[model samples]
Target: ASGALLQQMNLASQSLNYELSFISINKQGVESLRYRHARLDNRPLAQLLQMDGPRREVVQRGNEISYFEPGLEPFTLNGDYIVDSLPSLIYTDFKRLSPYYDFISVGRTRIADRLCEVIRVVARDGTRYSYIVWMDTESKLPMRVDLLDRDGETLEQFRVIAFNVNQDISSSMQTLAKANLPPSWTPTWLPQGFSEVSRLYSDGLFSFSVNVNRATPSSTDQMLRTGRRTVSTSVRDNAEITIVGELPPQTAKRIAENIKF
Candidate 1:
């Protein structure tokens, strides 16, 4: 629980300005999304430069977001709004979500062949899904976002498909976006580390938007080493940090056995 750890967590939480690929998975199936963000001032708007290999396609500028599907005419929307059950903070303002979601530093674990500090973000006051954010020890940018069920089953998952940040985009595409700005795009309230990045709409009738948020943990929850096999951490009446993932059920019990909040 040193200041440096907290700073690293914060930096990881506040990181913006990167082009990346996103893959979303749920009961329906796997869908892919690509995003690029830059010029994060007050709004931190992201323009959906291009998308492929998914059921939906989007392009955004300012507050306006647009959507284009294969069989339908482009759906255009003004201002900002969420169309699905997925948490808004996943993409836009992830940093703002850090405070609400409690973080516990649970030693070191290897995920995806990358050595990472496995920080478990349990639910604080609400019964939403807890997150296990695996930060790249070297880069600190997350490679995936997984939504787990009460049984520790993965409900929805999002991962980076592919990406390039700050590359030179064509002026024609840029000009097309500027010329097609929407009537209005705004979000009412958002969690920490989350902000409006970019979006798209279809003929002003439908709006599809995306946001990115970041987070760094505090010294209070930084419990690096554990003596036992499992540590159970609870969040009062709100939710519990259950074990599921690749960890065995007994190891999961240890996670449930150690409750600190």
Candidate 2:
């Protein structure tokens, strides 16, 4: 039944025309953001705006996403979802997880002042991170989420301060319903239940890419991890693969070595 609730969360979050104001707590620091989504004209549209900082924003119109940042050009990328900064659990597909995970009902809780159903997803492999999520009982929308290390340390947290559903979320998106937009590597041996969530991230004022080339004879493995971020590189078949994300160091190392030709 816990797995069933995750299904509800997946559908309710995507199927509803809603807006949410939330904050993310992590080792990098605390950040505030607003997310709004709607299906207008049978086409899905969504927006992510940083509540603080330089007013960075990502807007998805249909299949295109436009990024607006201060002192930078507004560029469009092609993607159906803006995965950056949004909680990874929000984009999780539990069917793949069921194989290596166990879902436990953690009773109930209150988030954003609404009664919520709490669920914990634990990795059966015992070498991966775990998650505890709170979904509103009424709407089955995620109200709070936490990512914990294998040692039970909190790596990241997403908590809603405010949200509204089924509102008149038009007027702003009407002009957007017709607008244009802009846009992974598959990582094997990922902490048991983890799957390839994305290939590129262009949300922050950062430039990142995976470079593939003929392997260098002198190439050696390298890694750098601080707090919650991990960057690991491995040379294979005279080639190099680098993995970077808010993941554990060993997990990144395993992914780079397990890369398929």
Candidate 3:
């Protein structure tokens, strides 16, 4: 039922060329952002820029993704999707996540000046957080997404203030699509479902990677902090696992411990 609606939203996020002006609010404060996505030569081209505060931008052409920050040097990564705005739950393929979540309809509503169908994605095992999404009826795109805690409190939100779907590609987007990408780099070893997409620094000061694995083991015992960032290392079924990222020690620990075999 509601699962099919979720599938459509996921497909639209990838297949539809659109621009979104949105606001993100969390405990830290509110932020404005703009996201543009297009398809060029049968490849995905997208950009996300912060509309306020320090300069922060994420650009993607095919599987090459680049990031630009105010003080930090720009870097590129290898991945198929961007994670700058909104909960990835709104854009993820629901079929792949069916094992972990149950989708239900909460009726329809209006958001961002569009009539939308509201759907809730609740964790099947109540272990992870849940989400509610207001999907535009006409465009099949998500207009707003809320990340909720178990107590039904909103932890974060991404609300679309304006959007244009299936529009002609912009010249700036065309230029970005054709831009030259940086040379690729690789980690010595990576987890089961993650890939080396972008690097954060030139001298290995920072590195960024994304994980999309569906099935894995979990451990709560191995978390380490080497230098400035936190790292997680664990052994499950006799296989040593190491996760490195610019994350807090507690976050790294929780992620490492939440792996499911």
Candidate 4:
């Protein structure tokens, strides 16, 4: 019964023109961010920006996403949804994930000075994480999302400080239907490439991706330089490469992060 809440959460997030001022509280620290999403010409155009620290921004023009970062040159990727910088579950297909997770009601709560309905998404198999999400009772828009480890401790949380719905954000963004981004060099991560590589991962979260001309490298300099727990070729990941990314900034690579909306 509760699983349907997730469905509504995703729909509201997609269909309404809204803005969110939120914070991501994790081990790394509290991060303030602003997310703007609007539909123009029946297409999704969104933007996410980090308020402090290194400059960063993710802009979406339909399926083409552009990233403006501190160092690496700005690049655009092909994707239907931009999940990072917001609660990933907001866009999740709860039905598809139902096999692994069981949705349950955890009662109602209040946030942003409004009554909310709280739902907990738990792994049925006891091998995955749990999410406690709060949604505005009237709008079905998500207000807060929390990640809890198996031990029942908070791992990370995406909380809405305030939000505006159905608001006019005509000037909020900024496109679509363009030639595919330049395909100068086929990144191995995409396909049809012989180049071999392997490495841990990290990001604003923590994922690592490294390509050694050799099959492997020794020491690898502080194997615990850490947080990333996934490899490039593993079909099954041991450590969840954050949905945000999988490589430390210094070792960042041009790999497409495809999460279809």
**The best candidate in terms of lDDT:** 2
What tens-digit string does per-residue lDDT give for candidate 2 at 41-61? 677788899998688998988
Per-model TM-score on C-alpha atoms: 0.49, 0.76, 0.68, 0.66
Give the per-residue lDDT of model 3 (tens digit) for 2-91: 989888988888888899999988777788999998887889999999988888999998898898888888889998778766456655
Error of 3 at 38 (Å): 0.4
Better of 1 and 3 by TM-score: 3
Writing each residue's lDDT as its tens digit, candidate 4 over 118-188 gives 99987664534467999999889889998776567777788899888866545545332232433311233
Top candidate on TM-score is: 2
Query: lDDT for every model?
Result: 0.44, 0.74, 0.70, 0.63
Ranking by TM-score: 2, 3, 4, 1
* Model 3 ranges off by over 4 Å: 70-72, 181-261
lDDT of 2 at 166: 69
lDDT of 1: 0.44
Total backbone collisions for each predicted model: 53, 9, 8, 15
Q: Model 2 Cα displacement at 37 (Å)?
A: 0.7
Tens-place lDDT per residue, model 1, 1-261, is: 422343464444334455556667777777656565543333334444335454565654556667766687776687553243223333333244445556667666554555666565664543334555555566555655565644677765756555444434445344544564434223332222322233321111112222112222311212221211122232322333332222223333443344333
